[PDB]
Paper text:
DExD/H-box RNA helicases, from virus and bacteria to eukaryotes, play important roles in processes including ribosome biogenesis, RNA processing and folding, ribonucleoprotein (RNP) remodeling, RNA nuclear export, the regulation of RNA translation and transcription, and nonsense-mediated RNA decay. DExD/H-box proteins often contain accessory regulatory domains and localization modules, but their cores consist of two RecA-like domains joined by a short flexible linker. The N-terminal domain is commonly referred to as conserved domain-1, or DEAD-domain, and the C-terminal domain as conserved domain-2, or helicase domain. Both domains contribute to the binding site for RNA substrates and both contribute to ATP hydrolysis. We used X-ray crystallography to determine the structures of the DEAD-domains of DDX2A, DDX2B, DDX5, DDX10, DDX18, DDX20, DDX47, DDX52, and DDX53, as well as the helicase domains of DDX25 and DDX41.
DDX53 (CAGE) is expressed in testis and various tumors, but not in other tissues. Expression of the CAGE-gene is determined by its methylation status. The 6th residue upstream of the conserved glutamine is an aromatic residue in most DEAD-box helicases. Its side chain stacks with the nucleotide base, stabilizing it in its position. Moreover, an aromatic residue in this position is not obligatory: DDX53 features an isoleucine, with weaker van-der-Waals interactions with the adenosine ring than the base stacking interactions with the aromatic side chains. In the crystal complexes with either ADP or AMP the loop closes up, resulting in a shift in Cα-atom positions by up to 3.5 Å between the ATP- and the AMP-states, or by up to 2.5 Å between the ADP- and the AMP-state.
Numbering used by the authors: 212 to 294, 304 to 340, 347 to 439
Write the structure that this text describes.
Amino acid sequence: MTCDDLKSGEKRLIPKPTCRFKDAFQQYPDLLKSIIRVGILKPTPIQSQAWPIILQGIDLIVVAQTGTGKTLSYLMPGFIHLDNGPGMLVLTPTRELALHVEAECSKYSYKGLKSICIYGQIEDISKGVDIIIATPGRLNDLQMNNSVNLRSITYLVIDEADKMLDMEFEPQIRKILLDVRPDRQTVMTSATWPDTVRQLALSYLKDPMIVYV
Ligand SMILES: Nc1ncnc2c1ncn2[C@@H]1O[C@H](COP(=O)(O)O)[C@@H](O)[C@H]1O
Ligand SMILES: [Cl-]
């Protein structure tokens, strides 16, 4: 596992890993209690590095395949960022992944946080929602149809961006991010880091760091 500052100009110190939940989230007893109740033992390597970076308000690229704990890498700090529609948006390439993310979300949710999983409905989004987990296709069609307000989103995750590219979802994603506000925090995940994904990434992130398993 490597970590770097990809900002132009002066490089910033890399926050120290937080190898215990307590070290990342001691400030947030309700999130800790939620973790304790689930009964997992320790942060995964990428969690231990991703968390302190996101908590400092720095945009992050995580390059990592499934099984490494990448979901909680971006979900936990998103919960903290939340405490006017949803404030958090997670874009996933497929229904299966959206469902996977939504399942982790509701397993670890506390302080009456509400999430919705949206894929290929409007009524639940018309009531209060804090977190949207969505495929780009269905979410784009919803904004066009005036069904969803994205203007309160300040925490955005783009999950599996290489898959997003293979699937040619760039036009839909670009259009969704337009309704999202520019002063936002952004995390991006990807299983790979070729030049096309690097270019895409920088079209989403400002002054980002990277964690690369
Ligand atoms: N710190 C952890 N300890 C044990 N399991 C975890 C941890 N973090 C995430 N997981 C689980 O590992 C699986 C793979 O997660 P991901 O790589 O995010 O798809 C998911 O089912 C998670 O709920
Ligand atoms: Cl390193």
